[PDB]
Design a protein around this ligand. Structure first.
Ligand SMILES: *[C@@H]1O[C@H](CO)[C@@H](O[C@@H]2O[C@H](CO)[C@@H](O)[C@H](O)[C@H]2NC(C)=O)[C@H](O)[C@H]1NC(C)=O
Ligand SMILES: [Ca+2]
Ligand SMILES: [Cl-]
Lengths: 102, 376
């Protein structure tokens, strides 16, 4: 069952548009890094802001984890299917996708 | 049911920095950026707390970072730049409980710290906080603490910070995650209004390890209570499971006691929402209790006092723990009052203000450096 509480939206518009997509999850224990995927490829080069908030009184309790990806100038190579992915142990979970095109 | 209710009001758009038990941060942010990026952070800030960590920005422990902090009511910056660490400490008093704007910014070859738009610190540095890798620019930022043990700061510090942020801005980003999750977790929000002291909701205590050796016990307590009953201050001798000294509210009176026997009583208007000052002084062949300048009558003969003070004297030669706000579930026959305190209180013992951030143990629901007001 998915830790993702929310999944990236869609962006759809002109060459040069700036916008954001985000995703959020909730996990038990040490919070994972969030990886942004475009057509199944983890993007190493991104404008991203990741937030971790511990909910319990202890770094081993629950955490909220969010990531925001930003597209500064829309163009063809930014086009695609966007999803967040995390590794919890050896397990993997992918979010519902979002779509960017022109 | 408490005779005097306290305000329960919290501000929805705030962030409580003192929520984590250990000076673990309440927020962790990690930035990846595509072009060179200069640190900029701006937040409003309110505390009465004179010491603790506001934020950390940089890479990691033995790398390059800054930490902005409070020491002695004033801002302290610590920096590590390629292996070499440094600390400066400058500017106006911060912990006055009034809102104020703090900016931290990377500018040319300087870091610039501003209070209410006044630059109060400007330090030359050789390097950038963002760490280039692969044409990716990386930075970690934590609020309300640091991501490593405080051992390894340039200069050690107690990072617990009973303080508050609002209207924050990190790197001019438009992410609204922090605001949204504070909204839904009241525990992350601050008292709408704070006044001075420490708040005891009446579910626990703090303790310390203090020496009193002739010998001496002086306590001044400033209190604004919610309830007519509760232990304010006490000593507890673990090995004999005894309570060699206590000062407490009971039914409306204050009692100063040695084990079970009351040495003095003073009347007090506990239920009027007013502040009061309780002071107690004891030493060889002397014990006195004051409430707001007036002295309580002795409850014991001169002969029984010497017996009681000599028992207390005996007790102080062995280890005792000093308790504020309650006792550890002791025998009902140990002391006159064994209940928890509810309300606001500041304590000073042998002429030293007790900082609750420094207790050996503090129950997490006691707020160390602020009290909500009395409820209108
Ligand atoms: C930001 O902080 C993280 C800690 O989350 C740093 O990454 C860790 O670095 C250690 C050793 O230095 C590695 O062993 C870990 O595997 C890392 N953990 C994760 C989850 O990545 C990271 O380096 C910091 N960023 C920068 C720029 O210094
Ligand atoms: Ca503190
Ligand atoms: Cl508000």
């Amino acid at each position: 069952e998915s830790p993702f509480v929310s999944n990236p939206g869609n962006i759809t518009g002109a060459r040069g548009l700036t916008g954001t997509l985000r995703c959020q999850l909730q996990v038990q224990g040490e919070p994972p890094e969030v990886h942004w995927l475009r057509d199944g490829q983890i993007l190493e080069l991104v404008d991203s802001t990741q937030t971790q908030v511990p909910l319990g009184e202890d770094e081993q309790g629950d955490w909220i984890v969010a990531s925001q990806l930003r597209i500064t100038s829309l163009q063809l190579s930014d086009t695609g299917q966007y999803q967040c992915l995390v590794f919890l142990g050896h397990q993997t979970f992918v979010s519902q996708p979002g779509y960017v095109r022109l | 049911l408490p005779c005097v209710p306290f305000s329960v009001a919290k501000s929805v758009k705030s962030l409580y920095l003192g929520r984590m038990f250990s000076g673990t941060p309440v927020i962790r942010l990690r930035f990846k950026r595509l072009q060179p990026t200069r640190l900029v952070a701006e937040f409003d800030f309110r505390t009465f707390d004179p010491e603790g960590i506001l934020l950390f920005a940089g890479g990691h422990q033995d790398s390059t970072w800054i930490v902005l902090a409070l020491r002695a009511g004033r801002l302290e910056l610590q920096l590590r730049y390629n292996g070499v660490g440094r600390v400066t400490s400058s500017g106006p008093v911060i912990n006055h409980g009034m809102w104020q704007t703090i900016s931290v910014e990377e500018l040319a070859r300087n870091l610039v710290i501003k209070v209410n738009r006044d630059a109060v610190m400007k330090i030359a540095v050789a390097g950038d906080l963002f760490q280039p890798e692969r044409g990716l620019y990386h930075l970690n930022l934590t609020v309300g603490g640091i991501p490593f043990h405080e051992k390894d700061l340039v200069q050690p510090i107690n990072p617990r910070l009973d303080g508050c942020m609002r209207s924050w801005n990190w790197l001019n980003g438009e992410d609204t995650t922090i605001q949204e999750t504070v909204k839904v977790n009241t525990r992350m929000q601050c008292f709408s209004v704070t006044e001075r002291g420490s708040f005891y909701p009446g579910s626990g205590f703090a303790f310390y390890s203090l020496d009193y050796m002739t010998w001496e016990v002086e306590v001044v307590a400033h209190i604004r209570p919610a309830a007519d009953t509760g232990v304010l201050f006490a000593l507890w001798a673990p090995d004999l499971r005894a309570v060699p000294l206590s000062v407490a509210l009971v039914d409306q009176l204050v009692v100063l006691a040695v084990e079970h026997t009351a040495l003095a009583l003073m009347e007090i208007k506990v239920c009027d929402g007013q502040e009061h000052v309780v002071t107690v002084s004891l030493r060889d062949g002397e014990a006195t209790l004051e409430v707001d300048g007036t002295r309580g009558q002795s409850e014991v003969s001169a002969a029984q006092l010497q017996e009681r003070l000599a028992v207390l004297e005996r007790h102080l030669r062995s280890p005792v723990l000093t308790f504020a706000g309650g006792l550890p579930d002791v025998p009902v026959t140990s002391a006159p009052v064994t209940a928890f305190y509810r309300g606001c209180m500041t304590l000073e013992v042998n002429r030293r203000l007790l900082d609750l951030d420094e207790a050996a143990y503090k129950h997490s629901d006691i707020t160390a450096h602020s009290c909500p007001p009395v409820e209108p």
